Amino acid sequence: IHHHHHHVINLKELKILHTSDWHLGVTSWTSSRPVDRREELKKALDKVVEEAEKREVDLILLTGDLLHSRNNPSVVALHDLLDYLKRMMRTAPVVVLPGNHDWKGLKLFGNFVTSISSDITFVMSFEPVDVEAKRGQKVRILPFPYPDESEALRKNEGDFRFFLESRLNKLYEEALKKEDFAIFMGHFTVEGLAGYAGIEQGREIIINRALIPSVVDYAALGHIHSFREIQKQPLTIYPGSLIRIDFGEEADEKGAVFVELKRGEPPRYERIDASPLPLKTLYYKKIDTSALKSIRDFCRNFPGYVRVVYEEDSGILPDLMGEIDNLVKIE
Numbered sequence: 463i464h465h466h467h468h469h470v471i472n473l474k475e476l477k478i479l480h481t482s483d484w485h486l487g488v489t490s491w492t493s494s495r496p497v498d499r500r501e502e503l504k505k506a507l508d509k510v511v512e513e514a515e516k517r518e519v520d521l522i523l524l525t526g527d528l529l530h531s532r533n534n535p536s537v538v539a540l541h542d543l544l545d546y547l548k549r550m551m552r553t554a555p556v557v558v559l560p561g562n563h564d565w566k567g568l569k570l571f572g573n574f575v576t577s578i579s580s581d582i583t584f585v586m587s588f589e590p591v592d593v594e595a596k597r598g599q600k601v602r603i604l605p606f607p608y609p610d611e612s613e614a615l616r617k618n619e620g621d622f623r624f625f626l627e628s629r630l631n632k633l634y635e636e637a638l639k640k641e642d643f644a645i646f647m648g649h650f651t652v653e654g655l656a657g658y659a660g661i662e663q664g665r666e667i668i669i670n671r672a673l674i675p676s677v678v679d680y681a682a683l684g685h686i687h688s689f690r691e692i693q694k695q696p697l698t699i700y701p702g703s704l705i706r707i708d709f710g711e712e713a714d715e716k717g718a719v720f721v722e723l724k725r726g727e728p729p730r731y732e733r734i735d736a737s738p739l740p741l742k743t744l745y746y747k748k749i750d751t752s753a754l755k756s757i758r759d760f761c762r763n764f765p766g767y768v769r770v771v772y773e774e775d776s777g778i779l780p781d782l783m784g785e786i787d788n789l790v791k792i793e
């Protein structure tokens with residue numbers, strides 16, 4: 463019973479697990495009623511890990527912000543990240559495209575970890591890397607990380623947009639230089655999203671979906687919280703977060719993406735539902751006796767969190783947050 467990669471001859475298939483935007487260490491609604499989302503997030507994370515072992519994925523892709531805090535993650539958040547990273551590695555080889563971190567030492571540690579292990583790879587530049595999947599599949603990764611060299615901080619609108627296109631063009635040329643499979647990994651915002659509102663904000667890199675290399679077998683994206691099927695040629699998917707961060711994601715479906723690739727057959731995928739706690743926003747003109755009736759009746763049998771939005775004040779409001787544990791925000 464070994465624990466290394468297999469080597470099947472003439473194998474032309476590739477099962478991929480794509481999850482993104484874990485936001486580990488997040489505490490929601492700190493200005494109204496602080497709620498630690500760790501237990502819910504870990505539960506959702508466990509379900510994704512189990513599904514990876516269930517379907518026996520060949521490669522695991524990680525994008526978006528795995529940590530909620532960009533430049534100051536808690537010890538607990540870091541612990542959970544390293545925990546689930548190891549859990550992923552026991553299942554299949556992992557490829558990680560980090561988001562915004564603002565720490566220079568991270569690239570050093572990223573290259574170090576990548577060098578000492580054959581089951582995890584950190585792409586923190588535009589340099590394409592070749593990786594080996596669980597069953598010995600040759601997979602070329604075309605990474606498009608967040609633009610560095612202070613180009614995001616300061617750059618002319620003409621050159622910067624031409625800079626992004628030039629980088630994408632080189633990724634296209636190098637995608638043709640592939641052995642078996644070629645996967646695109648990007649950390650940006652697709653031009654004209656319908657209708658993910660509330661990002662970032664934050665700095666945004668706007669890229670047309672047509673500029674993404676068409677010769678790749680799969681385009682793995684992140685940074686946005688909602689699931690999005692951008693296109694089919696090539697298959698471009700935002701997995702979305704695993705939990706509902708704020709009430710803007712009330713009607714969102716959270717989870718991961720399972721992608722299967724064949725040499726002759728076109729790409730197919732299934733959504734892996736994480737089934738996180740639901741959210742709900744109740745609207746009222748004034749919080750009258752009728753409004754209090756509706757609020758208490760709804761929050762009674764609701765397994766998730768509730769926000770109440772009203773227009774104008776009308777007398778002293780009862781301690782609703784006291785009698786109702788579900789109510790996290792009356793704004």
Ligand SMILES: CC[C@@H](C)N1C(=O)/C(=C\c2ccc(O)cc2)SC1=S
Pocket residue numbers: 528529532533534535543544558560563565568571572
């Ligand atoms: C080093 C790879 C991995 C564990 N990782 C981080 O450590 C990341 C961010 C980070 C680490 C330490 C800090 O003080 C701040 C950010 S993101 C990421 S993937």
Ligand SMILES: CC[C@@H](C)N1C(=O)/C(=C\c2ccc(O)cc2)SC1=S
Pocket residue numbers: 567
């Ligand atoms: C794998 C950890 C190893 C490279 N290491 C450090 O990172 C050490 C110290 C250190 C790292 C980051 C800091 O911000 C400060 C000290 S000592 C030591 S051995």
Ligand SMILES: [Mn+2]
Pocket residue numbers: 526527561562649684685686
């Ligand atoms: Mn991001």
Ligand SMILES: [Mn+2]
Pocket residue numbers: 483526527685686687
């Ligand atoms: Mn995010």
